[PDB]
């Protein structure tokens, strides 16, 4: 129901955004383990004969991880070659498939809020600095930030 | 007569599907340790991994209740026992160091055991445990002599595979704690620390930026191509690119002349901080040609010595400059006072050779 950091990498083996919520106002320094955990994945990308991939009309959620207190995953759409994942925190984890589909499709989420901040032409030559802030602008929200809507 | 592996599978969905009972999953546990010895000579793997959701499963009954070693000993033992998996099939010229991933996660959910269950010997600088009895560890020097014994062990032998470069890329680049968790001068484990960082430099960064900062420690204090008295300055003056903040924290600005403060030999470097742009060349007074230079500004100081050059179609002409610059803004009117004309200019002068800004450690562009 939370993440606990966001993943963005391109098609040339480069981290557009390890996002981490709360590392400012909270905990520092596990954004040290939580890219190494990304880069963990990131040449853990097909190793020793598990294959996450069959279906492919969606990409779907493919195979779930477990490693050292979090649970990582991935989702390849193989469309203009995203390599996105996103990690949970194993201790508030119930572990159904209702909760694998929900992360499925708010994994499909930030897919959309990626594709849409993709082509906004309202500030054009936005590749190296603030799209990347309002991207993290547009993150901070959809997971958190729900406390006062009501 | 014999029926394929979906009849398995679907048999093994429904009596996941049969409820009520009150066991500890022993009737999953029991079809799961018949598809698993069905599921050992196919040379696959992938039925492995199935077998390794079975054991995420059992890992998660056993963490619906498991904390503070009150029933966290009781979890960490279960999976002490459930190293079966590697107890089970161990064979050389297998389907690549399946088991040898195994173990790495088994050794991690032991080193979790260890790190966990309150006590301390932290051997892992990064506290993985979070908030809320097979004794292999009982002390702190010896919770690192069993660990790195294992970790060195199971780090390599997991390369024996086919060519992944996943986690001894990571892992065995991550031997910082190998001999810096008290030890200061790591020149016994120079090996990857001040040797070939720039590995998560070539990739993203703020990995190596800690990296960096561990590898300093091994010649802020220490004496004695492993030959040098200052020639690690790729890692402590050029090591301002990683460093985001220089007006905050500028002792990662200070050292990079302080390091040369008492140097003395020359190196490389990108210029990666001062950019450099051209401009429209003009004339000038007697044999004298004088380019037009625009030089940015990121790093702190002044007073440079560097000149300009141009390469024609045969040999260089290096038109010079002044070589007192003293950069401290950006895009500023740089001399570039140049003489001994190559033909006048003649055209064929594609300015391809580099224009050069040397403080006894040379940065070519």
């Not at chain 2, 002599?145 to 680049?173: M, P, W, Y």
């Amino acid at each position: 129901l939370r993440p606990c950091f966001v993943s963005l990498i391109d098609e040339s083996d480069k981290p557009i955004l390890i996002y981490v919520p709360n590392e400012a106002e909270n905990e520092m320094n596990d954004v040290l383990k939580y890219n190494v955990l990304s880069n963990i994945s990131l040449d853990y990308f097909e190793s020793a004969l598990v294959e996450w991939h069959s279906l492919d009309s969606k990409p779907l959620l493919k195979s779930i991880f477990q490693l050292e207190g979090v649970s990582v995953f991935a989702m390849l759409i193989k469309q203009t070659g995203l390599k996105i994942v996103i990690g949970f925190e194993q201790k508030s984890l119930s572990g159904a498939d209702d909760e694998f589909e929900a992360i499925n499709q708010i994994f499909e989420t930030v897919r959309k809020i990626y594709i849409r901040v993709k082509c906004n032409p309202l500030l054009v030559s936005g590749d190296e600095k603030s799209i990347i802030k309002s991207l993290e602008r547009k993150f901070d929200e959809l997971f958190i930030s729900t406390e006062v809507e009501l | 007569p014999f029926e394929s592996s979906s009849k398995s599978d679907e048999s093994l969905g429904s009596i996941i599907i049969e409820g009520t009972l009150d066991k500890f999953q022993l009737h999953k546990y029991f079809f799961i340790r018949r598809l698993r010895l069905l599921k050992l000579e196919d040379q696959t793997l992938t039925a492995f991994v199935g077998a390794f959701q079975l054991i995420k499963n059992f890992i998660e009954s056993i963490s619906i209740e498991y904390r503070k070693s009150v029933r966290l000993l009781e979890f960490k033992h279960y999976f002490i026992t459930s190293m079966l998996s590697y107890f089970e099939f161990e064979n050389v010229s297998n389907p690549l160091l399946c088991e040898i991933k195994a173990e790495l996660l088994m050794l991690k959910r032991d080193n979790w055991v260890q790190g966990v269950m309150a006590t301390s010997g932290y051997r892992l600088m990064d506290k993985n445990y979070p908030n809320s009895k097979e004794t292999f560890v009982d002390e702190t020097v010896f919770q690192e002599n069993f660990l790195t014994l294992t970790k060195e062990i199971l780090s390599l032998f997991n390369k024996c595979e086919g060519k992944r470069q996943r986690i001894v890329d990571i892992l065995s680049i991550e031997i910082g704690l190998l001999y810096y968790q008290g030890k200061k001068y790591e020149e016994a484990v120079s090996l990857f620390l001040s040797c070939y960082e720039y590995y998560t430099q070539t990739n993203w960064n703020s990995i190596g930026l800690k990296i960096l900062q561990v590898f300093i420690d091994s010649l802020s204090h220490c004496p004695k191509g492993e030959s040098v008295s200052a020639s690690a300055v790729l890692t402590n003056a050029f090591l301002n690119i990683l460093k985001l903040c220089k007006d905050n924290d500028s002792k990662e600005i200070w050292w990079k002349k302080f390091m040369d403060l008492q140097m003395k030999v020359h190196l490389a470097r990108a210029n990666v901080s001062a950019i450099e742009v051209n401009l429209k060349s003009y004339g000038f007074p007697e044999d004298i040609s004088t380019k037009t230079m625009r030089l940015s500004l990121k790093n702190m100081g002044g007073d440079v010595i560097v000149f300009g050059a141009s390469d024609f179609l045969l040999k260089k002409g290096e038109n010079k400059l002044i070589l007192e610059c003293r950069d401290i803004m950006y895009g500023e009117f740089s001399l570039l006072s140049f003489e001994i004309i190559v033909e006048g200019i003649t055209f064929v002068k594609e300015f391809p050779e580099n224009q050069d800004e040397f403080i006894v450690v040379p940065e070519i562009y």
